[PDB]
Design a binder for this molecule. Structure first.
Ligand SMILES: Cc1[nH]c(/C=C2\C(=O)Nc3ccc(C(=O)N[C@H](C)c4ccc(F)cc4)cc32)c(C)c1NC(=O)[C@H]1CN(C(=O)OC(C)(C)C)CCN1
Length: 503
C-alpha cells in the first residue's frame, strides 16, 4: 500500500546535492560495503560490472551458504566450493587468496569438514576488496547512487511521514500505535510517549536511554528502532511490529500450560541470541519475563520492553533494584552492584517457566505474598520434574545459581558459555541466526493473540534524531522501493540524476 506519489517522495536528488554528504561520510569499508544494507548491495553491484571482481562476490556467497549447511552435507558443499573457485583453471578463480592458502584449504577438506573451513579464504578476499576494488567503487557511479540513498535517509521524518492505524496496547505514559510508512507501505509499532507525562514525572533521561539503547541494538531477536520523531504533544518511537502475541499468552493460554522441551529450546535459543546482541553493547536488559517476549508473523521472537535497560560502562557495575516481582535476580533484590548477570538469571526463569508451565519460585496455583516469593528467590533451591531432561535441569539450575560469580554466562566468556551448554547440543546457532530453522508455532495472519520552557527543547532535539540508518535501508529493500528505484542508464550509462552536467 504505497502512497500514490511515492516515487516522487523517494525521488533521487541530483548528485550535485550530495557534496556535503561526500565530504563527511567516513569511507570505512565494512560500513559502506557490508554493515549498511544498501551500501552492501551497491558495492556488490559495482563488482557485477568488473569481470575480475565478480568471482569474489560469488565465492563469499557460497561460503555463507557453507556456514549454515547441515553438518552432514559439509564435505559435499566444501568439495563443490573447492572445485568451483579455488582450482586454477576454473573460469571463476580466486587468485588473490594466493596458492599458499588454497593448498591449505585442500588439506582441511582431506580431514574432517568444519563449518569454518573457508574462514581463512574469506578474510583474504575481504583484505583484497578493502583495497583497490573499494577505492574504485568510491569513484564509481554506484557510490554516487549510495550518496543519493543516504540523502533520502537523512530527510526529516514527521507525523505526515506515517499513517497511524489502531491502538496496539498501552503501557507507561502512552500507547503503542500502528504506523505505516506512507511512501513504502511498511508496518511498524509507534510508541507514543506523552510529553506532558514525561516532564510531570521528570523521566526525560529514561526516555532517551531507551531510545538510544534501541537505535544501537541491531538484533534479529530484539525490537529495533526505525524512527524517532516528535509530534507536539508526544515523542514517538517507531518499532518492529509483532503480531504473533507474547510468550506469556502462549505458555498459559496455548500451552499445557508450558511447552515441550524442544519447543522451549527454540525460544531459549533466540532469547539467548537477543541477550548476546545487547551484551555486545554492554547493555543489561533486567526485564526478562514471558510477557516481554513477543512473536512475529512467522513465529520468531524478539525482546520488546527495553524501558529498564541501561548501558553499562566497560569495566563498571551498576546499582538498581528494578523489574517485576518474581523475575529479579538475588543480586538485584539485595540492591548489590551487578553487571550483566541479571539477564542470565532471567533466561533461567524463562527456560524453567516454558518447560514447567509455572514460575520456579511461585506455583501457578499458589496465593503467596511478595515477601515469600523474594525469600524463595534468595534461599530455596528450585525443584524440577520429568518434563526436564538432565540437560534442561542442568542449564536451568546453572542459570539460576544464586551467586552471580558462579552463574552460567557471567564469566569472561559471556553468552558463548551458554551456547556450549549440552542443553543446546542439538541446536545449530549459525542456522538459527540465519533464520533457517522453522519456528515451532506459526501465528495465523488473521489471528489476534492477546511547556514553552527551552529546557524541554534541548531534550526534544537529542531524541528526535529521525531515521535509523540500517533499519531504514532494510525498509527500502523489503518494500522493493530500492529494487524499483535503483535504476541506471541503458547499457551501464549514467542516468540523468547521476550526471553532473544537466541537473
Ligand atoms: C501488534 C502489537 N505489538 C505489540 C508490542 C510491541 C511491538 O510489536 N514492539 C514493541 C516494542 C516495545 C514495547 C514496549 O515496551 N511497550 C510498553 C508497554 C509501552 C511504553 C510506553 C508506551 F507509551 C506504550 C507502551 C512494545 C512493543 C503489542 C502490545 C501489539 N498489540 C497488542 O497486543 C494489542 C492488539 N489489540 C487487539 O485486540 O487487536 C487489534 C485489532 C490489533 C487492536 C489490542 C490490545 N492488544
Amino acid at each position: 500500500g504505497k502512497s500514490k506519489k511515492w516515487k516522487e517522495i523517494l525521488k533521487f536528488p541530483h548528485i550535485s546535492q550530495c557534496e556535503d554528504l561526500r565530504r563527511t561520510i567516513d569511507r570505512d569499508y565494512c560500513s559502506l560495503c557490508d554493515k549498511q544494507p544498501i551500501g552492501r548491495l551497491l558495492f556488490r553491484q559495482f563488482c557485477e560490472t568488473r569481470p575480475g571482481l565478480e568471482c569474489y562476490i560469488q565465492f563469499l556467497d557460497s561460503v555463507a551458504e557453507y556456514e549454515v549447511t547441515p553438518d552432514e552435507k559439509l564435505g559435499e558443499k566444501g568439495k563443490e566450493i573447492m572445485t568451483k573457485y579455488l582450482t586454477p583453471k576454473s573460469p571463476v578463480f580466486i587468485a588473490q587468496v594466493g596458492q599458499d592458502l588454497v593448498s591449505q584449504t585442500e588439506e582441511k577438506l582431506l580431514q574432517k569438514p568444519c563449518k569454518e573451513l573457508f574462514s581463512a579464504c574469506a578474510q583474504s578476499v575481504h583484505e583484497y576488496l578493502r583495497g583497490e576494488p573499494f577505492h574504485e567503487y568510491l569513484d564509481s557511479m554506484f557510490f554516487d547512487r549510495f550518496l543519493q540513498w543516504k540523502w533520502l535517509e537523512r530527510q526529516p521524518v514527521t507525523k505526515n511521514t506515517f499513517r497511524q492505524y489502531r491502538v496496539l496496547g498501552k503501557g507507561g505514559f502512552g500507547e503503542v500505535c500502528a504506523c505505516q510508512v506512507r511512501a513504502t507501505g511498511k508496518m511498524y509499532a509507534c510508541k507514543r510517549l506523552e510529553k506532558k507525562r514525561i516532564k510531570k514525572r521528570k523521566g526525560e533521561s529514561m526516555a532517551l536511554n531507551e531510545k538510544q539503547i534501541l537505535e544501537k541494538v541491531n538484533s534479529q531477536f530484539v525490537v529495533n528502532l526505525a524512527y524517532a520523531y516528535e509530534t507536539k504533544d508526544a515523542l514517538c518511537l517507531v518499532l518492529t511490529i509483532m503480531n504473533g502475541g507474547d510468550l506469556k499468552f502462549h505458555i498459559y493460554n496455548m500451552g499445557n500450560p508450558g511447552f515441550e522441551e524442544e519447543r522451549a529450546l527454540f525460544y531459549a535459543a533466540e532469547i539467548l541470541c537477543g541477550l548476546e546482541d545487547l551484551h555486545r553493547e554492554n547493555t543489561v536488559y533486567r526485564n526478562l519475563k514471558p510477557e516481554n517476549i513477543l512473536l512475529d508473523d512467522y513465529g520468531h521472537i524478539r525482546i520488546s520492553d527495553l524501558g529498564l535497560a541501561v548501558k553499562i560502562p566497560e569495566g563498571d557495575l551498576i546499582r538498581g533494584r528494578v523489574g517485576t516481582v518474581g523475575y529479579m535476580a538475588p543480586e538485584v533484590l539485595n540492591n548489590q552492584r551487578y553487571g550483566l548477570s541479571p539477564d542470565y538469571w532471567g533466561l533461567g526463569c524463562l527456560i524453567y517457566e516454558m518447560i514447567e508451565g509455572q514460575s520456579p519460585f511461585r506455583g501457578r496455583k499458589e496465593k503467596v505474598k511478595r515477601e515469600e516469593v523474594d525469600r524463595r528467590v534468595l534461599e530455596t533451591e528450585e525443584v524440577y520434574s520429568h518434563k526436564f531432561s538432565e540437560e534442561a535441569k542442568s542449564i536451568c539450575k546453572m542459570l539460576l545459581t544464586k551467586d552471580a560469580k558462579q552463574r552460567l554466562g557471567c564469566q569472561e566468556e559471556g553468552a558463548a558459555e551458554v551456547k556450549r551448554h549440552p542443553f543446546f547440543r542439538n541446536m545449530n546457532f549459525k542456522r538459527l541466526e540465519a533464520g533457517m530453522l522453522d519456528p515451532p508455532f506459526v501465528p495465523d495472519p488473521r489471528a489476534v493473540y492477546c511547556n514553552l520552557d527551552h529546557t524541554d527543547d534541548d531534550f526534544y532535539s537529542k531524541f528526535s534524531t529521525g531515521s535509523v540508518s540500517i533499519p531504514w535501508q532494510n525498509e527500502m529493500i523489503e518494500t522493493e522501493c530500492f529494487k524499483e528505484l535503483n535504476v541506471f542508464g541503458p547499457n551501464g550509462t549514467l542516468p540523468p540524476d547521476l550526471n553532473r552536467n544537466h541537473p
